[PDB]
Amino acid sequence: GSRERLVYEVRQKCRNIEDICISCGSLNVTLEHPLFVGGMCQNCKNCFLECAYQYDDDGYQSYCTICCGGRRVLMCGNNNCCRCFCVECVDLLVGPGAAQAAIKEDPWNCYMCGHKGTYGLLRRREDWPSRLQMFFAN
Amino acid sequence: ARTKQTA
Ligand SMILES: [Zn+2]
Ligand SMILES: [Zn+2]
Ligand SMILES: [Zn+2]
Numbered sequence: 054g055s056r057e058r059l060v061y062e063v064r065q066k067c068r069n070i071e072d073i074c075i076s077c078g079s080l081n082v083t084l085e086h087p088l089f090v091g092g093m094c095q096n097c098k099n100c101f102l103e104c105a106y107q108y109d110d111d112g113y114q115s116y117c118t119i120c121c122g123g124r125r126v127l128m129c130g131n132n133n134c135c136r137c138f139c140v141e142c143v144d145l146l147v148g149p150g151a152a153q154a155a156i157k158e159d160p161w162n163c164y165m166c167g168h169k170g171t172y173g174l175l176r177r178r179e180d181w182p183s184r185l186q187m188f189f190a191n
Numbered sequence: 192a193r194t195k196q197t198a
Contacts, residue, residue: 109195111195113195115197116197122197123197124196124197124198125194125195125196125197126194126195126197127192127193127194128192128193128194128195129192130192130193137195155192156192156194158192159192160192161192163192
């Protein structure tokens with residue numbers, strides 16, 4: 054019933070990732086996450102609407118790109134990207150230990166910037182700019 | 192990666 058157990062089931066192909074909210078683990082998916090393959094529930098849609106483009110004075114987004122929270126986050130080293138990712142989301146959706154590899158990497162291109170585009174279960178949508186246009190549409 | 196606290 055936890056987010057961690059649901060993601061475990063996804064890795065075991067006992068469940069499709071589009072059928073879970075990848076930001077909180079809710080089964081009450083109401084849309085596809087606009088940036089990565091996977092679902093999004095109404096709570097997280099709302100958190101994204103309020104939170105996703107909040108910025109700190111360091112020029113970076115205030116919260117995690119995936120969950121729109123986090124207490125401690127990694128910042129993208131791309132001088133053209135202002136995104137952050139929390140350790141919890143990274144080690145869950147990419148895989149355990151992934152966050153510490155990324156923290157060590159210098160400089161680090163985040164999962165939205167990286168050319169590989171797929172990282173464990175974390176798969177960037179090829180059409181994320183279209184999905185963002187639709188998400189913020191009237 | 193640089194890190195930061197969100198709080
Ligand atoms: Zn959710
Ligand atoms: Zn997160
Ligand atoms: Zn980036």
